[PDB]
Design a protein around this ligand. Structure first.
Ligand SMILES: NCc1cccc(Cl)c1
Ligand code: NA
Lengths: 10, 251, 29
């Protein structure tokens, strides 16, 4: 449901 | 937020989203009180009845947001947590007494048109504004009904007389809580709801025109039920605790 | 806590009012 955030924050 | 409206852009620039890394989902609201500190409700991080005990690495904060689900490129900032602090006498067993936590961010967040801290009250701002009848403001991305909003929702609600709060419920209300909401007669409605917890109840001081966070969205019995009210953490009553943690672990 | 707290860049900082803040002020009787 949420747009994927940049991978850098994971 | 039940029975609110869409936020205006930049209206609540201290609003923080508490976001679960995996799965990707909203956990709770939160608020920015400085460039490296975020305030929320303890129960957003620690609530054993629901098998909830998050560590720093389980969570992100998303600051500067308006849209719930969109990644707001060039607008929001996403931060990782260095440390979580839950009030040592937070009562998750009984009544959510002292429902307050702090989150120190790994790095300073940069302020902008969309990102800006709220004030915490002093003794006098609290004495002055925490009065039955006086309205505060609650914002969050939580359920619109006891579906879900596209953008940040806002509702202004009156602080309620304390015996009225107590006589609405079987839970023991402490001095670290206050309740807010309109009564059944009043016509106007509104309440926080699921996913709004941890967010701010704020008031704009008529004296210095600054927004102060008077409460944290703590609990309700349903959402926007007649004869029922929302309960908020009394932020000024826990400010010695706030100040201790920040004096000790802040830079 | 910060000297600039609680003053919104897009409202107070520009002397602009949001649609419902007067509801709050009117309640501070
Ligand atoms: N459990 C979140 C919630 C629901 C209704 C009212 C409040 Cl204050 C908080
Ligand atoms: Na109600």
């Amino acid at each position: 449901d949420f747009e994927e955030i940049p991978e850098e924050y994971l | 937020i039940v029975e609110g409206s869409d936020a205006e852009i930049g209206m609540s620039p201290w609003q923080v989203m508490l976001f679960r890394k995996s799965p990707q989902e909203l956990l709770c609201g939160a608020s920015l009180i400085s460039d490296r500190w975020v305030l929320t409700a303890a129960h957003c991080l620690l609530y054993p009845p629901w098998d909830k005990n998050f560590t720093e690495n389980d969570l992100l904060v998303r600051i500067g947001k308006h849209s719930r689900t969109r990644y707001e490129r060039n607008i929001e900032k996403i931060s990782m947590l260095e440390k979580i602090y839950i009030h040592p006498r937070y009562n998750w067993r009984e009544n959510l007494d002292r429902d307050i936590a702090l989150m120190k961010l790994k790095k300073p967040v940069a302020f902008s048109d969309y990102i800006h801290p709220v004030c915490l009250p002093d003794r006098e701002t609290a004495a002055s504004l925490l009065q039955a009848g006086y309205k505060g403001r609650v914002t969050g991305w939580g359920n619109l009904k006891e579906g879900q909003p596209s953008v940040l929702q806002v509702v202004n609600l009156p602080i309620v007389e304390r015996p009225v709060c107590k006589d609405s419920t079987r839970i023991r209300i402490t001095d670290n809580m206050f309740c807010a909401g309109y009564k059944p007669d009043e016509g106007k409605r509104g309440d926080a709801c699921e996913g709004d917890s941890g967010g701010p109840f704020v008031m704009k001081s008529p004296f210095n025109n600054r927004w102060y966070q008077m409460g944290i969205v703590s609990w309700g019995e349903g959402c926007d039920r007649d004869g029922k009210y929302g309960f908020y953490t009394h932020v000024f009553r826990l400010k010695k605790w706030i100040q201790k943690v920040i004096d000790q672990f802040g830079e | 806590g910060e000297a600039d707290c609680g003053l919104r860049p897009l409202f107070e900082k520009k002397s602009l009012e949001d649609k419902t803040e007067r509801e709050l002020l009117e309640s501070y009787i």
